[PDB]
Design a binder for this molecule. Structure first.
Ligand code: KT2
Lengths: 187, 178
């Protein structure tokens, strides 16, 4: 229940401070990108933000380094907002091409859920104290709470997909692009 | 335990990343008008009332300029951008100081949290977690290698309907003591 409270808090933080701010205008930015910059008839950027939730909270900062079949392609147009005294705080998202048998098999806006980096740290540093098994518990509850939030959130309208999975980023037999592609091909 | 996550979040996902590069962005900014102070000033209003425009809290806090942007690859975002704002502090219509200044955004998150039924967070929960957030953040930075006299936290209560309080005067008091 204390792993509940931490995870509950980070999921609400993630919604209040990011998803609720960017999901309203996401499809507009994607549409702008597809109309004017990407006229590949089978290579349109898909309409949803894909959010990676590795349940071990192992979050590399470079997505491309994690898999050879993920290639960094471009950025969406930036989104700016005055926030808590910061003028023109920048919200940015990255577009990736997903490769399969040397072909561009998918194109999407893709990123990790950055709160998982905090769950990982607090299982690393004594002053936070959490167990690795706390971490794993908190990650599941984070995903579950986030799922709950998005289900009822007006800003989420077929424009966000959570991709939760157990495999480390270290793992010999796991393809991150294949994980993303399987979900993409379901829409 | 909500405030503990948010405090570690603010350190792990922000303060530890920007504080090591702060002294150099300020030096790059210093190209006559006044030297900026060496420290990031972080406002921690315990009522979690966090306006997006600082002049809305005090018209004597006026925006002056931005630092040069910091970029970093983060959680799959290429060149995530970290920006900060330089403000002047007026006293009798005239500039008395300038500093990099912002609110701790997790406190805005606690406030909005407490406004949403599904978060299950009372106004009383909110103040208690505001305090815990400040105490946690402080205990973290006391030990953090990246905090090297490059950050100043200002936590404060001001009751409802009380304008005896000048945020600009209070920041000026801290700048003058340092
Ligand atoms: N003042 C200031 N504060 C920042 C900044 N950067 C992070 N902070 C805060 O420091 C702590 C760890 O931030 P972190 O990134 O780990 O978590 C975030 C993140 O996942 C997501 N978010 C938000 C913006 C965003 C983005 N542009 N791109 C991708 N994700 C994004 O929403 C969470 C809560 O955002 P919030 O804003 O309320 O507080 C966070 C959080 O308390 C910053 O530049 N300026």
């Amino acid at each position: 229940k204390g792993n509940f409270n931490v995870a509950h808090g980070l999921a609400w933080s993630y919604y209040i401070g990011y998803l609720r701010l960017i999901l309203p205008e996401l499809q507009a930015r994607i549409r702008t990108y597809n109309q004017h910059y990407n006229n590949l008839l089978r290579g349109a950027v898909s309409q949803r933000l894909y959010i990676l939730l590795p349940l071990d909270c192992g979050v590399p900062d470079n997505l491309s380094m994690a898999d050879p079949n993920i290639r960094f392609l471009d950025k969406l147009p930036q989104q700016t907002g005055d926030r808590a005294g910061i003028k023109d705080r920048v919200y940015s998202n990255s577009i990736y091409e997903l490769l399969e048998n040397g072909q561009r098999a998918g194109t999407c806006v893709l990123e990790y859920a950055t709160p998982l980096q905090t769950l990982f740290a607090m299982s690393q540093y004594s002053q936070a104290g959490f167990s690795r098994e706390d971490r794993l518990e908190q990650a599941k509850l984070f995903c579950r709470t986030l799922e709950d939030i998005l289900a009822d959130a007006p800003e989420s309208q077929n424009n966000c997909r959570l991709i939760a999975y157990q495999e480390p980023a270290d793992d010999s037999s796991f393809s991150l692009s294949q994980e993303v592609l399987r979900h993409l091909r379901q829409e």
